[PDB]
Amino acid sequence: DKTVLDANLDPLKGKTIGVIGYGNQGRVQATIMRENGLNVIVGNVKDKYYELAKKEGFEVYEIDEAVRRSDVALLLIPDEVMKEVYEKKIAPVLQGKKEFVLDFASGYNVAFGLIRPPKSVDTIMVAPRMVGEGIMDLHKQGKGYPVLLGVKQDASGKAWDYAKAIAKGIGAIPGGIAVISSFEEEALLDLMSEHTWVPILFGAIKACYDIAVKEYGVSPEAALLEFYASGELAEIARLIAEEGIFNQMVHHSTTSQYGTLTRMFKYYDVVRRIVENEAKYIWDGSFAKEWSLEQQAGYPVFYRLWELATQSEMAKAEKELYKLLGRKVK
Amino acid sequence: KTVLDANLDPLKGKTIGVIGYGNQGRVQATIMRENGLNVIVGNVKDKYYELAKKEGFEVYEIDEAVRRSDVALLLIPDEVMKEVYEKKIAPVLQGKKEFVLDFASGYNVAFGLIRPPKSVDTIMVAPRMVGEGIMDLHKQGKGYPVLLGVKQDASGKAWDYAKAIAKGIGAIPGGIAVISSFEEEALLDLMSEHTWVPILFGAIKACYDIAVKEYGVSPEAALLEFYASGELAEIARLIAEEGIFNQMVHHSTTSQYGTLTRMFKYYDVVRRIVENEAKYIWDGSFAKEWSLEQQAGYPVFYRLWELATQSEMAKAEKELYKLLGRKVK
Amino acid sequence: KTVLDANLDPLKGKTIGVIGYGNQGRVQATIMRENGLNVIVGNVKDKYYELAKKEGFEVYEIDEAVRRSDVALLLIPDEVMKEVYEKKIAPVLQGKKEFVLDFASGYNVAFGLIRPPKSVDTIMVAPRMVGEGIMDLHKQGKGYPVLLGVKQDASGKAWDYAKAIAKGIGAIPGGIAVISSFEEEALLDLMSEHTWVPILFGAIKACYDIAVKEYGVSPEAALLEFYASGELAEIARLIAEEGIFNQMVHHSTTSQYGTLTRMFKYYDVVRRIVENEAKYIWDGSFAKEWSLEQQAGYPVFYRLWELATQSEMAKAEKELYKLLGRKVKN
Amino acid sequence: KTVLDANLDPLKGKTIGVIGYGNQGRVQATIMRENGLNVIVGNVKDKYYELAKKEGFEVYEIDEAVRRSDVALLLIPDEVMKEVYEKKIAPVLQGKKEFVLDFASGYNVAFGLIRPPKSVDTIMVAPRMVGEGIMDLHKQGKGYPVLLGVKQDASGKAWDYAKAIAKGIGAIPGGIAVISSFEEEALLDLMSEHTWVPILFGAIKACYDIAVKEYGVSPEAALLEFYASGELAEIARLIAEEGIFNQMVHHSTTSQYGTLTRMFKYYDVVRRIVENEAKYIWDGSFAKEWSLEQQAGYPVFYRLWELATQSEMAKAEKELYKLLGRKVKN
Ligand SMILES: NC(=O)C1=CN([C@@H]2O[C@H](COP(=O)(O)OP(=O)(O)OC[C@H]3O[C@@H](n4cnc5c(N)ncnc54)[C@H](OP(=O)(O)O)[C@@H]3O)[C@@H](O)[C@H]2O)C=CC1
Ligand SMILES: NC(=O)C1=CN([C@@H]2O[C@H](COP(=O)(O)OP(=O)(O)OC[C@H]3O[C@@H](n4cnc5c(N)ncnc54)[C@H](OP(=O)(O)O)[C@@H]3O)[C@@H](O)[C@H]2O)C=CC1
Ligand SMILES: NC(=O)C1=CN([C@@H]2O[C@H](COP(=O)(O)OP(=O)(O)OC[C@H]3O[C@@H](n4cnc5c(N)ncnc54)[C@H](OP(=O)(O)O)[C@@H]3O)[C@@H](O)[C@H]2O)C=CC1
Ligand SMILES: NC(=O)C1=CN([C@@H]2O[C@H](COP(=O)(O)OP(=O)(O)OC[C@H]3O[C@@H](n4cnc5c(N)ncnc54)[C@H](OP(=O)(O)O)[C@@H]3O)[C@@H](O)[C@H]2O)C=CC1
Ligand SMILES: O=C(O)C1(C(=O)O)CC1
Ligand SMILES: O=C(O)C1(C(=O)O)CC1
Ligand SMILES: O=C(O)C1(C(=O)O)CC1
Ligand SMILES: O=C(O)C1(C(=O)O)CC1
Ligand SMILES: O=C(O)C1(C(=O)O)CC1
Ligand SMILES: O=C(O)C1(C(=O)O)CC1
Ligand SMILES: [Mg+2]
Ligand SMILES: [Mg+2]
Ligand SMILES: [Mg+2]
Ligand SMILES: [Mg+2]
Ligand SMILES: [Mg+2]
Ligand SMILES: [Mg+2]
Ligand SMILES: [Mg+2]
Ligand SMILES: [Mg+2]
């Protein structure tokens, strides 16, 4: 229903695009838009990334200089420090604008109300659902990739004619898929993966090791070679991506199939209660209050939990094994 | 403990017979063919025989391979090793005054489903690898890990065989080889297929069923974030080659902080899950669950593919790939 | 939705192979011979054969019969069908190019105990009827209900057969036919024999064990009120004729008020009894319970008669029938 | 294990910069000037300066002092050390090639609130003493205990400094010095101010609130038995001289038996109180609780003073001291 695959590039012919940020994002969406023939500029603080970006012909300006030069901008800076740069530099300028847009990449700072643009402005979202550099490994092929789209304010009548038209210029369409969503759904799916099935994976290996070694008499050097020092995860995911999450398992054996399914439906009702509680804790914005306060205090907890992980009983006896193998490692 | 090398000299004058020619047969066979070792093959005559007839091997019947040789590698599955030991092979091994029997994975020994005689030496060589990449890793000359173990020894040299085998299947020198048992491997090679495999698939199934049903989300987008992307295919490449707690410097703090605060918040539940799942295996209460299913007709095994492959998630995933250009089943 | 009629020509010009001649075999058999149709009768040779040879039918052996015919009605139980498909029939069915295998109870398909090949059609025709009365009804001319379903179709005409068979077994036109699956066939045909059958027998056993041993009642009277009378037939005949909430006007309000006030007071308990009993069947965790019992020697099945048939209730029941003149136990 | 002595030459030939002149600054300061050592005294100028200029010391401003010297003893609280490192000092320390920063309480390091650079050594020297009695002890000649630790070393001599400092502050030889970390420094220094301090004050508050309001007791007597007398000091002086399980022979059996029978009856409850109170510190979930309070305006710390100082106990205590002649509240 909401599938979107093609859209014209005609609105932007005659409009300036101001890229913001030149991190490991800006070098991708800007370049794919440069060799697609659109007058585009760049804005950053001056560091190694400007000197790099000075070696590429880009018309780098200061930030507030670009955002009075241009017509639209792709605010490709992290979800951490977009608040300071909108509050301090940019937003006192946008009242000097009357026909303008502000294209975001991660809506953590909109759906939770941390930033509030005015009403004479259009806001949109263009989120690559892709690692970001693999795009450059793929865009040469002419095969695009998925994106996401959304709107907060449309005080110009043509928010969608911009958003649908942007994705055609960053190598996403025609050739891939473009999906229609909001910011409120953008931040949830972007967060619920970083809260629910990521740590519960790392939380099990930590407890399939702490049970195999300290209780059941197992060699530490072997316990890791079965969990996550082999090509299991490195190729379980490639198969899930290209075949089907419930269609790869014919490749494995029945002893691997039967034990999986009998225990997947046996624990669907105790990760449900983990996720329901972890989504209500985000839908209500009770995570921004947790993460926005940590930046004020000095990162006191974020500093400790690295020193428990990186000094535990697993990493200690893992760090030696890679020394006994010869990997590229700490 | 670790072994990193051992001479191939015990196995210059004895016959190796590999059984099975499947995902693992060709690779431990071919590598030992190019390493100067008179080796043979034994199987039923089928499509895997036919190319194996096109490869110069002495592909023979099973019990003829085992009156011929004194050593063999029984690379057949953990399911139907029992039928072939009780029926075809084991009545022969009484007629072998000395022999060695090299298993691959010890699901059929540590649980006592098979019991070789006492005039025999049992050993173990388990590739901890994907299986096919080993051949690409034989050409390179970079080996891979293995596991070793013993059930019964009546030669004083159960180890000089096992250590010396792994030198000849492209595992060492260049990789390592770790010392374990059958009892320890059938746990690690099962407790992965019980604990962190399903609880992964059990969360996506409930991070979707909560997003579409209760929170008003597009189905086509819910899949593009979880596991239809390039994400999952490279968070493993980094965990494998950098460190499970050292990839995270690449992500941002919004991705690091939410992870760690919730990993230590749930270590006391997946611990409580795995304790139950290990006691349900250490006591052999899984072989009784899996050996009975084979005897009934696979009745539960047949249903649970029919729920997974007809659920609310796969229905809308099976179509999104049609909107990308990938196959369907 | 609702089927009422279909042709009969898709089966004319073709042979039908009746398998089994039990208390259901003869019914669908004779009705199709009374309709003038070339049908054969495959069986093992016992008293049912010598009977079945006195009835004019042609008998061949099973693997000869299913070869001779074009479709067959495998009217053998759900218990020893697995042995006869595995041993005799199924090695023959690869020697055919179009064929059908008409089942009666799909307990042996939906649970995957049998798996027919790819070049074959599978269907279901379940008489939802007493079975014996159908002969008492074919001498009347009014049909009866059936059920229909498909497991696989490789002819494009899995339905023009199934819809057409039911007209030939005295079910339509005049009754109806309902469209379902095998997966729904076994559930409804099992949820009755798990949920409201035993809970009925489980209450009488506990309305007797409470009236005699705790409240001082004559045993000869406790049975005359529960189930020594035909009053249940006057609840069943009326429920079949009038309506399960319309047979109660015929009773009095003292019988209505106590019923309804307690039907809704316990709907929230038999719900939980049934939810557990349906999840224990949908997942196939009953075939594993019933297919193992056959393999052990029927050890539990043998005991539970000797508790029922030697209990406190049947003892004092078996004598009261001797004190009436009904069939005391053979 | 147990340190008892070390050299003093690694600091001779190098200046020492005393920061802070509080009730701890003067002590380690004067003892090092009494030992004939070139030391300076960096401070803000207040009554502690004018004092500190009357004592002969050289005062410079902070960023002038820490520039002048080679090492410094940052004897300022754990509360406003973050502001002075962030604002003044730390931008200077990149202009040095070898330096040391000797702390006193590692609440501001182990919780990551401060992060010194890579070209710097960090150490810990914690007086485990009242602090004022050290001057009463330096006029005696007997030293006292300390603690030692390291956060980073880039000289190979993080220990020949730390071991050597403690000899210069009247701690060794004659006392001892113990080897620990910052992470253990803050825990033991906090677990005492969380666990056995309040549970003491929490019992007297509930041995008074039960004796007066429920069991009919004179308020003027309930205090004279608990803590109006020096009997606590007669329990503390003896525990320091004799042994925490050897001060009890001096008491009677009625005082011995009731103690021990109830110490082991409640060891399994204060265990659970402390396990929760240590996991709430090891994870740094206290700095997030204390660093936020400073930002809001101290709203809770103002209230909980007004409940204690207006309670039912202090009211009738503040008058009894007026009825004795001790320091009634200022
Ligand atoms: N796994 C991941 O982390 C992935 C994230 N993404 C998204 O893709 C993009 C990632 O590109 P990446 O290159 O990783 O971004 P980086 O963080 O790598 O670079 C950030 C950019 O912002 C500038 N910058 C950083 N901090 C500040 C600051 N405090 N004040 C001002 N400017 C600052 C940087 O330096 P200068 O200004 O000198 O250039 C640079 O241009 C982001 O939008 C991210 O959300 C999507 C997929 C993968
Ligand atoms: N899954 C993996 O990647 C890993 C596998 N292993 C172990 O190695 C072995 C691999 O098993 P798998 O890869 O499944 O082998 P395959 O299923 O890949 O091939 C099966 C082989 O066994 C023969 N075979 C199959 N069924 C029968 C039977 N019923 N009777 C007789 N012969 C039969 C086949 O035909 P023919 O007889 O004509 O050859 C073929 O040679 C297992 O022991 C497994 O534990 C080790 C590490 C990981
Ligand atoms: N209970 C009912 O009223 C209902 C019945 N049905 C279905 O109709 C069928 C009725 O089965 P049922 O009534 O039990 O049949 P019967 O028990 O009435 O008669 C059994 C038939 O099967 C043959 N037979 C029995 N055991 C074997 C065996 N071990 N090997 C070979 N042949 C055997 C018998 O002998 P021979 O082969 O010599 O004839 C006879 O023909 C079932 O599928 C049931 O689900 C449908 C609706 C309700
Ligand atoms: N309190 C105790 O029971 C003991 C504490 N300690 C430890 O030793 C140190 C003692 O701290 P404390 O005794 O509280 O020091 P004091 O409170 O005794 O004196 C405070 C010192 O710091 C300076 N100062 C106070 N506030 C500020 C400020 N906001 N900005 C700049 N300078 C300031 C004061 O004025 P100026 O700068 O003008 O001198 C003075 O020199 C801490 O590290 C503590 O952990 C050691 C033993 C016992
Ligand atoms: O915000 C994040 O961390 C991303 C994710 O969805 O994983 C990259 C966008
Ligand atoms: O079938 C199994 O047991 C294997 C596993 O991955 O655990 C392949 C070896
Ligand atoms: O035996 C069975 O399964 C039947 C039932 O009534 O449930 C007769 C069909
Ligand atoms: O037998 C019945 O149904 C009666 C009732 O109304 O309770 C006694 C008449
Ligand atoms: O810093 C603290 O909190 C101290 C304590 O009372 O334990 C003074 C040392
Ligand atoms: O106050 C006490 O503890 C005494 C006792 O005998 O218990 C008087 C000494
Ligand atoms: Mg994210
Ligand atoms: Mg993610
Ligand atoms: Mg496995
Ligand atoms: Mg595995
Ligand atoms: Mg039934
Ligand atoms: Mg029924
Ligand atoms: Mg303290
Ligand atoms: Mg203290």
From Swiss-Prot, chain B:
<dbReference type="InterPro" id="IPR008927">
    <property type="entry name" value="6-PGluconate_DH-like_C_sf"/>
</dbReference>
<feature type="domain" description="KARI N-terminal Rossmann">
    <location>
        <begin position="1"/>
        <end position="180"/>
    </location>
</feature>
<dbReference type="InterPro" id="IPR013116">
    <property type="entry name" value="KARI_N"/>
</dbReference>
<dbReference type="InterPro" id="IPR013023">
    <property type="entry name" value="KARI"/>
</dbReference>
<dbReference type="Pfam" id="PF07991">
    <property type="entry name" value="KARI_N"/>
</dbReference>
<keyword id="KW-0560">Oxidoreductase</keyword>
<comment type="similarity">
    <text>Belongs to the ketol-acid reductoisomerase family.</text>
</comment>
<feature type="domain" description="KARI C-terminal knotted">
    <location>
        <begin position="181"/>
        <end position="327"/>
    </location>
</feature>
<keyword id="KW-0521">NADP</keyword>
<comment type="pathway">
    <text>Amino-acid biosynthesis; L-valine biosynthesis; L-valine from pyruvate: step 2/4.</text>
</comment>
<keyword id="KW-0100">Branched-chain amino acid biosynthesis</keyword>
<dbReference type="InterPro" id="IPR036291">
    <property type="entry name" value="NAD(P)-bd_dom_sf"/>
</dbReference>
<dbReference type="GO" id="GO:0004455">
    <property type="term" value="F:ketol-acid reductoisomerase activity"/>
</dbReference>
<dbReference type="Pfam" id="PF01450">
    <property type="entry name" value="KARI_C"/>
</dbReference>
<keyword id="KW-0028">Amino-acid biosynthesis</keyword>
<protein>
    <recommendedName>
        <fullName>Putative ketol-acid reductoisomerase 2</fullName>
        <ecNumber>1.1.1.86</ecNumber>
    </recommendedName>
</protein>
<dbReference type="GO" id="GO:0009099">
    <property type="term" value="P:L-valine biosynthetic process"/>
</dbReference>
<dbReference type="GO" id="GO:0009097">
    <property type="term" value="P:isoleucine biosynthetic process"/>
</dbReference>
<dbReference type="InterPro" id="IPR000506">
    <property type="entry name" value="KARI_C"/>
</dbReference>
<comment type="pathway">
    <text>Amino-acid biosynthesis; L-isoleucine biosynthesis; L-isoleucine from 2-oxobutanoate: step 2/4.</text>
</comment>
